[PDB]
Design an enzyme around this catalytic site. Structure first.
Site, short mmCIF file in Angstrom:
data_model
loop_
_atom_site.label_atom_id
_atom_site.label_comp_id
_atom_site.label_asym_id
_atom_site.label_seq_id
_atom_site.Cartn_x
_atom_site.Cartn_y
_atom_site.Cartn_z
N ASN A 164 -10.05 -2.14 3.17
CA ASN A 164 -9.86 -2.95 1.70
C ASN A 164 -11.37 -2.72 0.87
O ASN A 164 -12.52 -1.94 1.41
CB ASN A 164 -10.30 -3.52 1.01
CG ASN A 164 -8.03 -4.09 1.85
OD1 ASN A 164 -7.53 -3.05 1.12
ND2 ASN A 164 -7.90 -5.64 1.94
N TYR A 223 1.16 -4.72 12.11
CA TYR A 223 1.52 -2.53 11.58
C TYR A 223 1.85 -2.45 13.13
O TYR A 223 2.85 -1.02 12.71
CB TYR A 223 -0.70 -1.95 12.04
CG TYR A 223 -0.60 -2.68 10.46
CD1 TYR A 223 -0.45 -4.07 10.04
CD2 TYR A 223 -1.38 -2.37 9.81
CE1 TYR A 223 -2.21 -4.86 9.18
CE2 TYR A 223 -2.01 -2.21 8.10
CZ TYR A 223 -2.14 -3.99 8.53
OH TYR A 223 -3.20 -4.68 7.21
N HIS A 268 1.28 -0.95 -0.39
CA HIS A 268 -0.35 0.00 -0.18
C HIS A 268 1.16 1.35 0.01
O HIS A 268 1.09 2.18 0.86
CB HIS A 268 -0.96 0.43 0.93
CG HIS A 268 -1.93 -1.55 1.00
ND1 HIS A 268 -3.17 -0.58 0.54
CD2 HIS A 268 -1.75 -2.38 1.48
CE1 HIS A 268 -4.25 -1.76 0.73
NE2 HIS A 268 -3.10 -2.90 1.51
C1 HEM Z 1 -1.88 -11.03 7.34
C2 HEM Z 1 -2.74 -10.24 6.81
C3 HEM Z 1 -1.54 -9.15 6.45
C4 HEM Z 1 -0.47 -8.34 7.42
C5 HEM Z 1 0.68 -9.59 7.58
C6 HEM Z 1 -0.94 -6.69 6.77
C7 HEM Z 1 0.42 -5.91 7.05
C8 HEM Z 1 0.22 -5.08 6.64
C9 HEM Z 1 1.49 -3.96 6.73
C10 HEM Z 1 3.05 -3.95 7.73
C11 HEM Z 1 1.48 -2.78 6.31
C12 HEM Z 1 2.01 -1.79 6.25
C13 HEM Z 1 1.66 -0.57 7.31
C14 HEM Z 1 2.88 0.14 8.06
O1 HEM Z 1 4.01 0.39 7.51
O2 HEM Z 1 2.32 1.36 7.88
C15 HEM Z 1 0.38 -3.13 5.65
C16 HEM Z 1 -1.00 -1.84 5.17
C17 HEM Z 1 -2.23 -1.91 5.01
N1 HEM Z 1 -2.65 -3.23 4.80
FE1 HEM Z 1 -2.42 -4.58 6.24
N2 HEM Z 1 -1.90 -7.12 6.37
C18 HEM Z 1 -2.69 -8.06 6.42
C19 HEM Z 1 -4.02 -7.91 6.24
C20 HEM Z 1 -5.02 -6.71 5.14
C21 HEM Z 1 -6.07 -6.71 5.12
C22 HEM Z 1 -7.29 -8.10 5.32
C23 HEM Z 1 -6.82 -5.43 4.47
C24 HEM Z 1 -7.81 -4.98 4.97
C25 HEM Z 1 -9.01 -5.67 4.60
C26 HEM Z 1 -5.62 -4.27 5.58
C27 HEM Z 1 -5.71 -3.73 4.12
C28 HEM Z 1 -4.33 -2.13 4.50
C29 HEM Z 1 -4.44 -1.36 4.15
C30 HEM Z 1 -5.40 -0.02 3.70
C31 HEM Z 1 -2.77 -0.94 4.61
C32 HEM Z 1 -2.22 0.96 3.68
C33 HEM Z 1 -2.63 1.46 5.98
C34 HEM Z 1 -2.03 3.29 5.54
O3 HEM Z 1 -2.93 3.06 4.53
O4 HEM Z 1 -0.96 3.18 5.84
N3 HEM Z 1 -4.56 -5.11 5.70
N4 HEM Z 1 -0.60 -4.00 5.95
#
Ligand code: HEM
Ligand code: HEM
Ligand code: HEM
Ligand SMILES: [Cl-]
Ligand SMILES: [Cl-]
Lengths: 474, 474, 474, 474
Positions: free
Chosen positions: D124, D334, D51
């Site tokens: 999402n 996160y 993202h």
């Molecule tokens: C094992 C499952 C998941 C892992 C390990 C994971 C991990 C991560 C990580 C490490 C980030 C970066 C955070 C940062 O650097 O600030 C991120 C961002 C993001 N993730 Fe996930 N994620 C997972 C599942 C999901 C799911 C299921 C969704 C939504 C239903 C989602 C939506 C998002 C979004 C929207 C961002 C961007 C947030 C922003 O705008 O800063 N993720 N995720």
């Protein structure tokens, strides 16, 4: 023999900076001046949040009695089996420049480079600890370190915290005894402290306690001398370990374990998983495993001693975690600490490399020395050749009961401390009391002193009486 | 009053971790446990490569004599003009946990929050230094710190380096005199050491030397006592500064300068730009400027004392650099050190913020607290409102001569050290000799000792003779 | 073949997390889950501040004509001499995910692993640049990148900056010509751009210009197609380089230099040291040196292409810097950028290691893979065996004149741009105009457009007239 | 209006570097040149591991229906209650410079600054996900990103992974439908995806699903146009959001939830906690909660959009986690990611600050802007005034059963995907098939294609048949 830059280009003058005329300004084009100064500027890395002051040495572990009937741990499978290891000893509260001879528990960290992975036994020179829940570690350590405002040590904070945490009485008693300040790292014991789990090839489970008994014998420093040495030689313990090994007086420890079968454990959960308590050696005597010997000093202190990374969570097949809450927290804490202090790729540094092959899908990160050949960095995949899970290594399953929640522990904070207090010879008891008096006596809040004294009194009436008496004499 | 997470959500239990049943494993969903432990794991930052052990205090500077005839520096323009300031005192070699009462030069860093920018005067409690070229700093410091192999201090390295660097004799003599260990930070002087440049409104140039004379008087610790205190109280100097200010015994220093006009300076380059030399106070007497007073302790040590960033290159209009080679290197080194130790945006931390407005095109970087409103981050641009250069602030131009090259300095390493040696009273000379003997006497390489002794002999025959004799008597 | 943790311990289940019961919460003791996720979380490192999007390849350089009469550079000493090298091609403004086929200068970075150190030739696919003083780089790049408020590209900023910087006209003309978008990295030239210095064994000095002419020929993409490819295949150039090498169609470049004897420079300082100008090839024709051939793709992109560090300041004996102000600033910038982006010890990563031996007193720093054996980390020292300076490598001295100050360059911003404009064939001129119109035409501030058009008019009346008319047709 | 350094000192010349004579070398004493270049060198920070490409905006949430009967969440307690919020929309795989109009799920991150802490809803534009266990995230993401060897995207890896992970069929179907590429962020829905937990004041528990329905309506881009826009305007979605808000066409979403009482949930664990499945809207219809409106663009993109930190684990009283294994892993991920990407003290940056008061014992760390006043940084302590736990905020306890172990989930990977496939209108089905064909058709390994096609066939015979048929036509 020729001085070079970091890119191998020779240095013409290492005494004088490039200048515009004899008395003119220094030039930015003196790239080596810039480089030399810039690298010098980046020499410091963050010190360990705790156990910052330490010494290390290479050695070996040799099995004297096979433990195959209790654990499938490869490095303990055969009699005479040798395993390379690295150890790091340290204090707890002191920063990088603090003296060695201070009153404090001593770290006893061991990294075994086994054929099935690096196994770390991160123990202390005490079988127990001050707290039983990891959520309290930052609080304990904060009270043990510097005043956030003045930067001075605060006995007020030390005792305020202990006076509200009676579970610390047992370890406080050990801390204040003679063993609170070892003569040297070679003259103290090592313990895993926590109850760990052993599982054999048949899947049979055993709860164990590690005991590393010094073959040089227990020797301590009287408080007065220790303070004197803290000034005359702040690296007294580091120097001692180094000189001993250079003189070929290799220090060794005999490792033996206490073995408690699963069935037995079912009755002693409140004791077995409380790190503020010991398991009676009469009920469960020590069983010798082997000998640890330190026989080689580091090539470079920073590269090996400062950069080494230990973690109680670095298990090998056959050894697993127990429900000890303090241990549980540590399983997360260390790996996390490593990533901040050294980096995501700290495992690639020589001192941290595994003897056993490392096959992952983990990639990149800062200062990645080796990313490999493969185009395949995901699993599952359709390439038979790539690394796959080994179901054989799954941990042993155990039953879970009741509700998810915030549970408190036992309140038997006094019995074992009293047992220890009764075992101390008269001369050591006077030291125990004087050590406490000297510390607790510095507290200003009379309510903190009273609360603490009532705590000691609850351990043993004489204990509390003697402490209160010693303070009055100041 | 309610405990919260870093996002303001309340904490329900700060004593027990979430667990799957009373004796069950700890749960990963205990986000607060994770956060608390993780932030605790990141509390340590790299210590300063040098001057790691220090103490700080807020204060003020008050002009007693306007210096407008010599410099257009705003904070020195009117009699009675007050300027807020922050000071940090420290040792040089010791790490974060080292004791205060060790033999070492003392840092005397000052940050003046003036109306035309933060002006830093990063001096020492000595008017000179051990080396004259910045390219040698890493070498000097390495020799002064720990053995890369054993991590123990090495007098062999200390003296090997000095024996090959005769320009250090003058400062070594000061280091080994009684002033090598002040009674407290309040009982030592402060100096800019380097010759700096002052330029007035008419563009007239003057070379100056800063002298901060303690109004509490010079007081030192005999070597023996200092070692004793190093054990009994490693934070002796930090505590002293704090207690004095809390007791309203505000320490102060009278600042006066030596002023050398351009015309005069033309003939004295070899002396003026050599930091291992002082300028005769008979030829150029001290001229009082004002008074520095420390009257307020820090709110939080880490936030203010540990994170503060000083740089000799932080000039304000009216004060500029001289061709002193050591100073020249420092102009680069500090800003560079700050970026690694604190970060690209360290200037945004409260203790480092300028009083005067900051208007740049500098943007982003890690932990950027304020990036502003503007869409315009480049210059030149067509927006009259955006920050523009101030031609008025250009530095005074000076002539450059000869060829770009690697020039060596003078070989006059003995005269001033001899002058100092001759002014020391008999009792202090004995201490000077014994201090050197105790240190140099630990060296094994007889060739290093001989080379050094020949150096002292060249300062004064008696000096070298006394040192040699002292060593022989051990 | 067995999946392991970073410490070599086998992984039992890489598909399911440890859970307290089939539908129970995930356990913190699943150390591998934690580690795998944590390392994944740290995979990203900061991208290069400029030239972030690139491709790399290994190759060799073979001398066809010895240059010993002009430089003592070892890798250019004999005919047929081969030197291993690594190259990285890139765009300038785009971030990591940007498309290859955009209008922008292309980076042409080369690292020669010579026997006397790694020599870096960090050039572009253009002989000139937009600015002549490094102090303007952040301003230029800021205008070229995203709006700080909206994060959208800003032609208003691009042109506002260029309209106030007439020295950019020459390079803007090259940028907007067909060569502004190469067909592939294999179809563009390479240049050192800056005038560098060559010194032979006798100490004779020569000013030189490097020209790497593509043996595949110059080929470009029409603007429309490039935009199409930017959508259909953002990694078009990276893929092309890789496929070509995998298909054994090794791209090569013929390197030749322009050689100007020191004395000849007396009439050309204004041209020779201004990077917005070129040196006449009729007056100083190209002299062939050798051939560069890329014949091997990286083993891993991140480890080699992303982590490689180049610096114009990475000279080898015989090649030195010139007084070009833009080059001068770069001498500082790159090494500094490396320390932030990769780390203090980036030189220890395989792709950055020198072929020639590296012998320093530089120590420690984050992720230090090798600190060595020596107890001696300072110089001068009394150990003959340790690395010493090589006076032979001192740079050639040159005369300095006048005053230290802020000097402005030449005002001849139009002549060379006009010469280029007159050499372009009719069809390319139409493209040049349309490319400018499409960009400048997006500007809102009529004052910016007018200022720019007056600038083009000053290059050539027709140039400005055509641009103004093309915009009018929108 | 006057240009200054980072310490507030005025800059005299921002166009020319200090030089030793008109054509002389650049001087190291040009501290501003150094600072300007050095800060520019440190502008880049690591991009989000996923993202990375996003846009943000400030807004508000207004309750239309109180949810007090189901959750004690303060921000949802009263009708009309307003809460400030910040949102960030993004793609998943693309890096910082990638185009907006690519096929990929879209991030829908929301941060509510409530009176009881910052509540983050990190969702999402899809109600489900590709995997159900966090341990597989790095694997999924690696397959979705660049080839570690060539740096090119790899459909072979994308499909190899999906062909071995049938649980991804449902989301793959959504990804490949028209909604795979929204017309703009304003024309897509938002979902929490996971089942979360709501607890009211009486302690009653409810499992919920969040649904943010766009009030602008669902609109998508046909694949061809999207590719065209990817070239013509890579920031199409970012620009759209910004222009809409600047034009006062504030986009809004109506939030409604699906509420499942604890007792009901007991029967649907396999569906409720499996993120690859949705809960029927007939059995549990949407219940309106309130409206989210975005009405203000960022002041600075980097400071707000790039540095904002969201975490699904940032709960507020009344909202808790469910046993969803994917969610469980995210609870750790996160916070951990934030500490690496931004820093230990990221919560102190304006965009991340809580509206509600933050009272901790957490201290120091890099770039600590505020450490406070208190001398008390440990708990328990004897100071009534300091922050204490709020038992009232403990999470609701729930029962745990069986054994600790590695459990696998449901095998019903086809039913819901088939239901969706049957609901798609003929024209969208043709697109669904063609989108899959265009991607899967690029795979070389026939065994991967066959495995995948058998998977689609299992969803619906026609589905697989049509896919196989579309590929054959290439
Ligand atoms: C094992 C499952 C998941 C892992 C390990 C994971 C991990 C991560 C990580 C490490 C980030 C970066 C955070 C940062 O650097 O600030 C991120 C961002 C993001 N993730 Fe996930 N994620 C997972 C599942 C999901 C799911 C299921 C969704 C939504 C239903 C989602 C939506 C998002 C979004 C929207 C961002 C961007 C947030 C922003 O705008 O800063 N993720 N995720
Ligand atoms: C909640 C409980 C505990 C926490 C959170 C904790 C945390 C930490 C941390 C963060 C470090 C620094 C690791 C690094 O940066 O490499 C460390 C080091 C250390 N700890 Fe613990 N600890 C706890 C309990 C214990 C216990 C009970 C013992 C022994 C029984 C122990 C022995 C040590 C030792 C020996 C080291 C030094 C390792 C080395 O030499 O690198 N700790 N601990
Ligand atoms: C080549 C010569 C020198 C070099 C390269 C050098 C370098 C450094 C460096 C890198 C620091 C750490 C800065 C930070 O991390 O914030 C420092 C601190 C310090 N230096 Fe120097 N230094 C030199 C000469 C001197 C001299 C001659 C004096 C005084 C006359 C001096 C006084 C100090 C002081 C007081 C500090 C501590 C500042 C503080 O409290 O943060 N140094 N130096
Ligand atoms: Cl981290
Ligand atoms: Cl840095």
């Amino acid at each position: 023999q020729h001085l070079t830059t970091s890119q191998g280009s020779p240095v013409g003058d290492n005494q004088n900076s490039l200048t515009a005329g004899e008395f003119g300004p220094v030039l930015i084009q003196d790239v080596h001046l810039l480089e030399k100064l810039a690298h010098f500027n980046r020499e410091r890395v963050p010190e360990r949040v705790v156990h910052a002051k330490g010494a290390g040495a290479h050695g070996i572990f040799k099995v004297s009695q096979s433990m195959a009937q209790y654990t499938k741990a490869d490095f303990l499978s055969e009699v005479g089996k040798e395993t390379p290891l690295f150890a790091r000893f340290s204090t707890v509260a002191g920063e990088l420049g603090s003296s060695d001879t201070l009153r404090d528990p001593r770290g006893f960290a061991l990294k075994f480079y086994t054929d099935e992975g690096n196994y770390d036994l991160v123990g202390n020179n005490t079988p127990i600890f001050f707290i039983r829940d990891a959520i309290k570690f930052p609080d304990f350590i904060h009270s043990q370190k510097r005043n956030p405002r003045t930067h001075l040590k605060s006995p007020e904070a030390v005792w305020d915290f202990w006076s509200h945490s009676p579970e610390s009485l047992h370890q406080v008693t050990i801390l204040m005894s003679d063993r609170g300040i070892p003569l040297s790292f070679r003259h103290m014991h090592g313990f895993g402290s926590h109850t760990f789990k052993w599982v054999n090839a048949a899947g049979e489970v055993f709860f164990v306690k590690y005991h590393f008994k010094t073959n040089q014998g227990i020797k301590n420093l009287e408080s007065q001398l220790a303070e004197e040495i803290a000034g005359k030689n702040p690296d007294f313990h580091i120097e001692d370990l180094h000189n001993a090994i250079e003189n070929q007086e290799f220090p060794s420890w005999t490792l033996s374990v206490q073995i408690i079968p699963y069935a037995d454990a079912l009755t002693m959960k409140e004791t077995l998983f409380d790190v503020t308590k010991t398991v009676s050696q009469k009920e469960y005597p020590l069983i010798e495993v082997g000998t640890m010997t330190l026989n080689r000093n580091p090539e470079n202190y920073f590269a090996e001693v400062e950069q080494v990374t230990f973690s109680p969570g670095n298990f090998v097949p056959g050894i697993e975690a127990s429900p000890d809450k303090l241990l549980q927290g540590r399983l997360f804490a260390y790996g996390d600490a490593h990533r901040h202090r050294v980096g995501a790729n700290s495992h690639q540094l020589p001192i941290n490399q595994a003897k056993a092959p490392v096959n992952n899908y983990q990639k990149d990160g800062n200062m990645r020395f080796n990313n490999g050949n493969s185009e395949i960095n995901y699993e599952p995949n359709s390439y038979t050749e790539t690394p796959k899970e080994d179901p054989t290594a799954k941990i042993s399953s155990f039953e879970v009961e009741g509700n998810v929640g915030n549970y408190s522990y036992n309140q038997d904070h006094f019995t074992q401390a009293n047992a220890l207090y009764n075992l101390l010879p008269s001369e050591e008891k006077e030291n125990l009391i004087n050590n406490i008096a000297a510390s607790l006596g510095q507290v200003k809040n009379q309510e903190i002193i009273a609360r603490q004294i009532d705590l000691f009194t609850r351990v043993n009436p004489e204990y509390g009486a003697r402490v209160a008496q010693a303070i009055k004499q100041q």
